[PDB]
Design an enzyme around this catalytic site. Structure first.
Site, PDB file in Angstrom:
ATOM      1  N   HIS A 173      22.655  74.575  21.752  1.00 54.40           N
ATOM      2  CA  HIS A 173      22.419  73.337  22.459  1.00 54.40           C
ATOM      3  C   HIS A 173      21.066  73.204  23.146  1.00 54.40           C
ATOM      4  O   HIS A 173      20.445  72.163  23.087  1.00 54.40           O
ATOM      5  CB  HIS A 173      23.547  73.088  23.447  1.00 54.40           C
ATOM      6  CG  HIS A 173      24.852  72.780  22.791  1.00 54.40           C
ATOM      7  ND1 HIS A 173      25.161  71.529  22.313  1.00 54.40           N
ATOM      8  CD2 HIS A 173      25.915  73.565  22.508  1.00 54.40           C
ATOM      9  CE1 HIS A 173      26.364  71.554  21.772  1.00 54.40           C
ATOM     10  NE2 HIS A 173      26.844  72.776  21.881  1.00 54.40           N
ATOM     11  N   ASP A 179      23.664  65.742  26.209  1.00 54.62           N
ATOM     12  CA  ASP A 179      24.427  66.594  25.321  1.00 54.62           C
ATOM     13  C   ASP A 179      25.838  66.073  25.241  1.00 54.62           C
ATOM     14  O   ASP A 179      26.362  65.539  26.196  1.00 54.62           O
ATOM     15  CB  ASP A 179      24.402  68.044  25.784  1.00 54.62           C
ATOM     16  CG  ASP A 179      24.868  68.996  24.721  1.00 54.62           C
ATOM     17  OD1 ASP A 179      25.416  68.527  23.717  1.00 54.62           O
ATOM     18  OD2 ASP A 179      24.696  70.213  24.885  1.00 54.62           O
ATOM     19  N   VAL A 187      14.352  87.701  19.586  1.00 51.44           N
ATOM     20  CA  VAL A 187      13.042  87.586  18.881  1.00 51.44           C
ATOM     21  C   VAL A 187      12.820  86.115  18.523  1.00 51.44           C
ATOM     22  O   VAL A 187      13.762  85.361  18.582  1.00 51.44           O
ATOM     23  CB  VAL A 187      13.028  88.460  17.619  1.00 51.44           C
ATOM     24  N   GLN A 212      13.090  83.468  16.146  1.00 53.80           N
ATOM     25  CA  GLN A 212      13.647  83.331  14.773  1.00 53.80           C
ATOM     26  C   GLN A 212      12.760  82.472  13.881  1.00 53.80           C
ATOM     27  O   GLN A 212      12.547  82.871  12.738  1.00 53.80           O
ATOM     28  CB  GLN A 212      15.002  82.630  14.809  1.00 53.80           C
ATOM     29  CG  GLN A 212      16.048  83.305  13.945  1.00 53.80           C
ATOM     30  CD  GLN A 212      17.229  82.409  13.702  1.00 53.80           C
ATOM     31  OE1 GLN A 212      18.375  82.827  13.791  1.00 53.80           O
ATOM     32  NE2 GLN A 212      16.944  81.155  13.411  1.00 53.80           N
ATOM     33  N   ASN A 232      21.572  74.996  13.744  1.00 61.10           N
ATOM     34  CA  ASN A 232      20.122  75.115  14.013  1.00 61.10           C
ATOM     35  C   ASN A 232      19.528  76.169  13.080  1.00 61.10           C
ATOM     36  O   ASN A 232      18.523  75.880  12.475  1.00 61.10           O
ATOM     37  CB  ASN A 232      19.843  75.350  15.497  1.00 61.10           C
ATOM     38  CG  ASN A 232      19.867  74.087  16.328  1.00 61.10           C
ATOM     39  OD1 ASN A 232      18.912  73.330  16.342  1.00 61.10           O
ATOM     40  ND2 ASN A 232      20.947  73.862  17.038  1.00 61.10           N
ATOM     41  N   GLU A 281      16.625  75.276  10.225  1.00 63.76           N
ATOM     42  CA  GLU A 281      15.283  75.902  10.287  1.00 63.76           C
ATOM     43  C   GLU A 281      14.960  76.533   8.936  1.00 63.76           C
ATOM     44  O   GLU A 281      13.844  76.376   8.453  1.00 63.76           O
ATOM     45  CB  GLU A 281      15.304  76.981  11.364  1.00 63.76           C
ATOM     46  CG  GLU A 281      15.370  76.416  12.762  1.00 63.76           C
ATOM     47  CD  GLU A 281      15.637  77.425  13.854  1.00 63.76           C
ATOM     48  OE1 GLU A 281      15.841  78.595  13.526  1.00 63.76           O
ATOM     49  OE2 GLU A 281      15.642  77.023  15.020  1.00 63.76           O
ATOM     50  N   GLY A 320      33.962  78.956  14.521  1.00 67.37           N
ATOM     51  CA  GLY A 320      33.640  77.549  14.808  1.00 67.37           C
ATOM     52  C   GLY A 320      33.277  76.696  13.616  1.00 67.37           C
ATOM     53  O   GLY A 320      33.916  76.826  12.580  1.00 67.37           O
ATOM     54  N   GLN A 343      30.537  76.806  11.903  1.00 67.14           N
ATOM     55  CA  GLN A 343      29.666  77.587  10.996  1.00 67.14           C
ATOM     56  C   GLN A 343      30.246  77.621   9.579  1.00 67.14           C
ATOM     57  O   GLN A 343      29.467  77.557   8.641  1.00 67.14           O
ATOM     58  CB  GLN A 343      29.500  78.957  11.646  1.00 67.14           C
ATOM     59  CG  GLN A 343      28.928  78.856  13.050  1.00 67.14           C
ATOM     60  CD  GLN A 343      29.358  79.962  13.976  1.00 67.14           C
ATOM     61  OE1 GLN A 343      29.840  80.994  13.542  1.00 67.14           O
ATOM     62  NE2 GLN A 343      29.232  79.734  15.269  1.00 67.14           N
TER      63      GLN A 343
HETATM   64  O1  LIG Z   1      17.201  85.926  18.066  1.00 67.17           O
HETATM   65  C1  LIG Z   1      17.411  84.724  17.957  1.00 67.17           C
HETATM   66  C2  LIG Z   1      18.689  84.097  17.819  1.00 67.17           C
HETATM   67  C3  LIG Z   1      18.759  82.764  17.722  1.00 67.17           C
HETATM   68  N1  LIG Z   1      17.649  81.964  17.741  1.00 67.17           N
HETATM   69  C4  LIG Z   1      17.743  80.504  17.677  1.00 67.17           C
HETATM   70  O2  LIG Z   1      18.964  80.117  18.236  1.00 67.17           O
HETATM   71  C5  LIG Z   1      19.158  78.733  17.887  1.00 67.17           C
HETATM   72  C6  LIG Z   1      20.629  78.428  17.839  1.00 67.17           C
HETATM   73  O3  LIG Z   1      21.222  79.130  16.749  1.00 67.17           O
HETATM   74  P1  LIG Z   1      22.412  78.363  16.054  1.00 67.17           P
HETATM   75  O4  LIG Z   1      22.428  76.966  16.523  1.00 67.17           O
HETATM   76  O5  LIG Z   1      22.301  78.639  14.609  1.00 67.17           O
HETATM   77  O6  LIG Z   1      23.719  79.084  16.592  1.00 67.17           O
HETATM   78  P2  LIG Z   1      24.287  79.623  17.975  1.00 67.17           P
HETATM   79  O7  LIG Z   1      23.529  80.843  18.365  1.00 67.17           O
HETATM   80  O8  LIG Z   1      24.360  78.514  18.958  1.00 67.17           O
HETATM   81  O9  LIG Z   1      25.772  80.027  17.570  1.00 67.17           O
HETATM   82  C7  LIG Z   1      18.371  78.537  16.586  1.00 67.17           C
HETATM   83  O10 LIG Z   1      17.263  77.689  16.840  1.00 67.17           O
HETATM   84  C8  LIG Z   1      17.849  79.941  16.274  1.00 67.17           C
HETATM   85  O11 LIG Z   1      16.595  79.929  15.635  1.00 67.17           O
HETATM   86  C9  LIG Z   1      16.394  82.495  17.897  1.00 67.17           C
HETATM   87  O12 LIG Z   1      15.392  81.808  17.925  1.00 67.17           O
HETATM   88  N2  LIG Z   1      16.349  83.853  17.987  1.00 67.17           N
END
Ligand SMILES: O=c1ccn([C@@H]2O[C@H](COP(=O)(O)OP(=O)(O)O)[C@@H](O)[C@H]2O)c(=O)[nH]1
Ligand SMILES: O=c1ccn([C@@H]2O[C@H](COP(=O)(O)OP(=O)(O)O)[C@@H](O)[C@H]2O)c(=O)[nH]1
Ligand SMILES: O=c1ccn([C@@H]2O[C@H](COP(=O)(O)OP(=O)(O)O)[C@@H](O)[C@H]2O)c(=O)[nH]1
Ligand SMILES: O=c1ccn([C@@H]2O[C@H](COP(=O)(O)OP(=O)(O)O)[C@@H](O)[C@H]2O)c(=O)[nH]1
Lengths: 444, 443, 443, 436
Positions: free
Chosen positions: A15, A112, A323, A325, A344, A348, A363, A365
């Protein structure tokens, strides 16, 4: 930057990051933006990210709100994000003082989904045009959107669920929690969908070529105002990472593993991929989260094992923690992505055209994986199921990892998605034009 | 769905509405609570502030009521007099309710304010519901009052209410039979407009009053909904707990007579004489001044220093507001002495305390009967009306001893305690009904 | 909706439900409707039904009549003592009727009390009408009972009414043929008071009962109006058919024995055995309590564990009340097993659902006869008055299988449904009369 | 001190001052006393007195009724009636009254009130036994005669002339008659009646009230002063010799015209009495009164500046009368004042301007307390000469018999004041009757 706009993410990395992304994006298009955060944050990570963002973007302004205490056990068990989101509602009224003092009155506010119902009163007293940004799949969002009539319609769970102008969603993709009316999660979604009626527009991190069926389905489905914003642009948070090893590797040779902001699986299963990862021989960059939900709670790389880390000493490198991503995914060296299929992460990868190995855990996913497979962006095996429902094979996983590295058809199709995604951000693109049009409509 | 709660004066009226409101909010309705100022008692004002700081998302609607204006309804009670003042001013709230930013789907009104409130939302799209503070058995007597008043030419024994056992004439309060008095006029005026209410909420469970709940359903109030027992909003800072912790379990006998009930000067000294004579450990809440807490400015000069010294080993006497629901939960309290106002009664039942029944005024006598019927407590009918009667130390002490040592009661009381738990459970009827009700609210 | 109309049903679901339907029909057609009920209601169901009606249909007002104490001897039936306790308080409609704002243009009164309101319609000149809930052939027998019970009172193979197919004595209840029973007195006396009525509505049409409409027209009831089939009222729900959704179309047999229990426990079990042999998928609504909703407390003790488990994946049983009309309408339902209460029969024809006839008591046997003649259902005469004989499972199974696979029946049954619609359509004969009656009524 | 009691006077210091003394007296006798007051108060003085009273007595509680929207004092008495129900909440919250003592004027309204909140109630009359009977016998008298005669007779009471009787009280139409007649009827409800009198002062008067159906009358006179202490005022009082000073007070309201008042001012210097004069400007209102001592003239002040002192406004009468310096009193003859004179044993001259006072003057005459001239009559009716006044004024100073008669009267007053005496005895008894 004449127009004044705010965006208000509630909780969770999935979010939070996008809304920041929406704000940076909005600033880029001559908008004056304030970003609203509510504290204390659930995770150490959320603040870490927030602090950088404001430092990185001076023109954008931080607008904190401090939460008040709450204690309701009606919400099942203890998952903090629903609790955090729930608390935000308890303190949401605290917002009103904050909005009354804004220098150039907010033209619009982006909120949100989780608290769209609480804000509504706020949005009638201060007449702010209110918008929402969707972090989920349009196909998955289509399911929530049609959920209330569908929840009203039956008492039992059928083999396949039909959302009206879309391909039927298999129940296996749907979460259990969604299905049972008694459960709160059902309560939160149903009420909030209703509140969409008040909103001027709904924005989703997907683009029309990408979810053509769903976006239209949504259109005649009672969600007329939905705008395909996505893909959300990079945060431009440069930089905090050292990657001497990545540079050495040949372009598209390395495989990136992230299971999302939160950990997704059991150690026994986790060791199984690690064992299968060795069998594949893919060069890899792996980001591991010890704590399934909270960054603060994880002080555990004990889980992979002593022998494996030394065994893959030159084959790959792993980070225990956080890190960037997207920074890693844009590197020439990364050629394959195994993800948990949070929207997300899926979006990406599509923007950078990296072939996905879909391994959904919980969820929404699972539903995103179906979009990943329909898009042709990634390879997914539906029979793997939910996390701990079944224990999927080291040998079985290895065949799939080997296919992603050596399937040229995926690379040609993954390359197309990058081009399709890039074209929508170009001046003639529907997504860029829709964002530009929405900004034009905001009143002084 | 927006729901508004309109309690009348009194902690007996106030406590139940706030309690429900917290329950409603927990279950996700948007809740507004209507309060008016001034309030008769300090506790109500202090409580409201505490409740709101604990529950932030519940809106507080405050209206200053008009100055007391009246003709008729002979009333000698401060809480009842305030109820009349709220009722005469409820019609001036029509302008405010019409313009509320999140409009109310429905109002849950107090029984006393139901007639005025029913007129108030007539041309507004708001469902009208009423919460009943008292027992279901008293509601049967309320329903029968017109029939009771019409065919009540003779002062003899008891009147048989149609679907349950006949009530003794001694139990019906004399004020209820006099139409001039406020208690009767308000009871009669509200029952007539109950038919305009979507549903009537009650603080009893189906197990507690099966005959009373069923009798009302077939007696024209077919919309009755049991939601009891109501749950505490568990908001509290001050700790008066320490003495009890020292006490052995079940030794202590708790005596309290509600928010605004006081004993006679001869009765306070005779009750105190009995507590010493019994030899029982005890906790006494002394409300000598009277109903209003503010004017009851005295400080234990009712008994004298001599008495406190004698009893200090076995008793603590507290003058002031006490956290009753917490005390009752304590291992130490094995007995309760009650005027049997329903909210105390329900609490005794939920927490399984044996009850000694001692009505002083109004419904207390019938409720005392319910308490006896369910095994919850022992009731002495011969004692009759407190405030109309005086009981000596010898009589009081023996009863105090008897309640403390009835093992059948302690076993019996527990069984009710279990039943109260079941109803709160998702399967259990009372929670299920509320869950059923809540859905209804969404329109 | 200018014209002001009130319909008065005294007791029973069978009496109550049709009247509500007539009321709904009148409001839709431009009458302003008051519905009169007498409390306390004999059953929980009428009350359940009535409250929903008023909440669902809110432009229709509810007028209630509180009944007085009754004590007459000579225990008969709970709905017959309630039909005579409504006549012991039918003079309490005087004050109510005088107060009504738009004064009544016409009132529709249940046939059981037409003799008692005669006086009330003269004093307040209300043109009064009555709606019959039985069949047109059984009303003929009711309407000639006085003239038949003047001659030698006894039993023959067939007793005949003027201009219709002779009715056998096996279809006629035995209590109707003895002139010293309660029954006859009430029927004889209310047929005499049909001459003061302006019209007599019945729940049937002329394709269904061509001879009965003319037999009743040429025998003293010239102002008879067949306005069938009565339309359905709303209810808002449906968590009764999760299994119904999974089941295929026309594959489910619906078993209903009416508002009340019918056959003896021993007999039912054979059907249960019978159902099993047939393989028919089924939805079964069982009423344990033979006459009272309030009295029925039995559950799985009617059929035994043995059966409920075996049919676990093929059929479902609901105890108590179900929305029968909504269920029949469902695509899944393909057969109907009925006690042939007339109201049930007219909906089966209206909905085109095939019937297996098992008349239990009273007019039901004649209705069974009507079902046969229409081509609506299969009937076995020899099965007899309920509990008269014990019917073996094998015999029951065969008729049931025969019902499932009998094509002509569906074709004839399908044909009946089209005709029922034809009457309802605006050009329709039954539709025309109801429209016409309103045109007559004067403001 | 178990018993708990409350007092309620509507208006005038004619009623309030006695009531407070009643309140203090009750506290002395072991009673929890609450004083109920009406606001806004008509007079600044009325308000002034109350604050002092509570402040002086810490342990006496004050309860007040805010008020909702001819004579100001009479009309307000009317207003209290309007708002009487306001009393209802107040009684309900009380920390409950063993009894309430209420003003005569509003007794009729309260009857409903007493019956619902069961409270034994009493009234205390600030007027004389002779006058109370005239009020007391009034209702029968009005309907029976409907005429004007030189004298009127109350059954066991010597008839007093019409000339004494106030004209308004005579008229049936008038508001005043309705209040007086109605209230006496209400007199039936009260379990006691109290008047500021003792039997000795009016044995004849007290009896007639006993005879005439006011069986429950109780005379608790004289009422003890509720007072402040100690202020160094009137250095001009201590200086003079005993009984050298004539103190003049026409009321707790003004009573005569500037020219009529000028004749006494001129008469005072001819008389030669040293004086302390309480001069009120307002005919009926202290807040309304904003005139300086210009009615008497500048000249009068210069000539007499050594001889006597003039106080514009209020003064403590009991405090002044008790002083050795005072030997003469000139009174408008309001009963409360008259009673004060008898208890303090200070010779009086009676010049009653209005109302009950002329009858009060008659009582003084029977008593021997003071010298009165009947002919002078109702105030402002006639002009009484400066020369005529002095002869009476001098006579008041130099009459030996009066001093003797006055001396007894003070002596008589005390005997009732003491424990053996009835007025003390009844108080003791009534309190004893009072039930917790
Ligand atoms: O080490 C990490 C883990 C996650 N993300 C970012 O976390 C965001 C949210 O991930 P997503 O929505 O896929 O799932 P969530 O973590 O909410 O389940 C995305 O932009 C990812 O690129 C990131 O930048 N680095
Ligand atoms: O000193 C007290 C007295 C009362 N109560 C609370 O007041 C509630 C209502 O009292 P009840 O209705 O039993 O008697 P009432 O005050 O209405 O006469 C009870 O639940 C008690 O918990 C309390 O907390 N402390
Ligand atoms: O479980 C039931 C039983 C009956 N009915 C309806 O109520 C009426 C009762 O049936 P009927 O009067 O024909 O039989 P009886 O009342 O004589 O037993 C019919 O219109 C049915 O449509 C229903 O809705 N649910
Ligand atoms: O300057 C003044 C005038 C009057 N009084 C008091 O006025 C009271 C009542 O006066 P009274 O009723 O006799 O006269 P009125 O009020 O009728 O004019 C007495 O107690 C006096 O002490 C006083 O204290 N000071």
């Amino acid at each position: 930057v004449g127009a004044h706009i705010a965006l208000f993410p509630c909780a969770g990395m999935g979010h939070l990051l996008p809304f920041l992304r929406l704000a940076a994006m909005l600033d880029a298009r001559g908008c004056a933006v304030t970003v609203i955060t509510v504290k204390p944050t659930v995770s150490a990570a959320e603040s870490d990210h927030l602090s950088a963002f404001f430092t990185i973007h001076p023109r954008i302004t931080r607008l904190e709100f401090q939460l008040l205490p709450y204690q309701k056990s009606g919400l099942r068990n203890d998952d903090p994000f629903f609790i955090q989101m729930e608390t935000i509602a308890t303190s949401v009224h605290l917002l009103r003082p904050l909005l009354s003092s804004l220098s150039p009155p907010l033209s619009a506010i982006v909120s949100d989904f989780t608290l769209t119902s609480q804000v509504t009163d706020l949005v009638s007293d201060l007449p702010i045009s209110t918008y929402t940004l969707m972090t989920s799949s349009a196909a998955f969002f289509c399911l929530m959107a049609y959920l209330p009539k569908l929840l009203q319609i039956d008492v039992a769970n059928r083999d396949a669920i039909e959302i009206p102008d879309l391909g039927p969603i298999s129940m296996s993709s749907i979460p259990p929690k969604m299905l049972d009316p008694s459960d709160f999660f059902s309560a939160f979604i149903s009420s909030n969908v209703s509140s969409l009626h008040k909103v001027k527009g709904v924005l989703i991190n997907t683009f029309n070529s990408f979810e053509s069926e769903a976006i239209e389905a949504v259109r005649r489905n009672g969600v007329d105002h939905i705008l395909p914003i996505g893909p959300l642009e990079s945060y431009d948070a440069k930089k905090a990472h050292d990657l001497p090893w990545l540079d050495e590797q040949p372009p598209e040779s390395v495989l990136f593993v992230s299971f999302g902001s939160r950990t997704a699986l059991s150690k026994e299963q986790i060791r199984e991929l690690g064992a299968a990862l060795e069998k594949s021989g893919c060069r890899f960059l792996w980001v591991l989260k010890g704590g399934k939900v909270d960054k603060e709670d994880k002080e555990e790389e004990d889980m992979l094992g002593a022998s494996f880390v030394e065994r893959t000493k030159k084959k790959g490198l792993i980070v225990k923690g956080w890190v960037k991503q997207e920074q890693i995914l844009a590197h020439p060296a990364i050629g394959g992505f195994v993800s948990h299929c949070g929207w997300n992460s899926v979006i990406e990868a599509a923007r950078l055209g990296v072939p996905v190995l879909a391994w959904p855990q919980h969820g929404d996913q699972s539903v995103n994986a179906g979009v990943v497979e329909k898009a042709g962006l990634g390879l997914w095996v539906r029979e793997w199921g939910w996390g701990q429902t079944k224990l999927i094979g080291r040998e079985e996983i290895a065949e799939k990892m080997i296919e992603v590295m050596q399937d040229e058809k995926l690379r040609v199709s993954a390359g197309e998605v990058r081009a399709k995604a890039k074209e929508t951000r170009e001046v003639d693109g529907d997504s860029e034009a829709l964002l530009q049009r929405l900004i034009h409509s905001f009143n002084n």
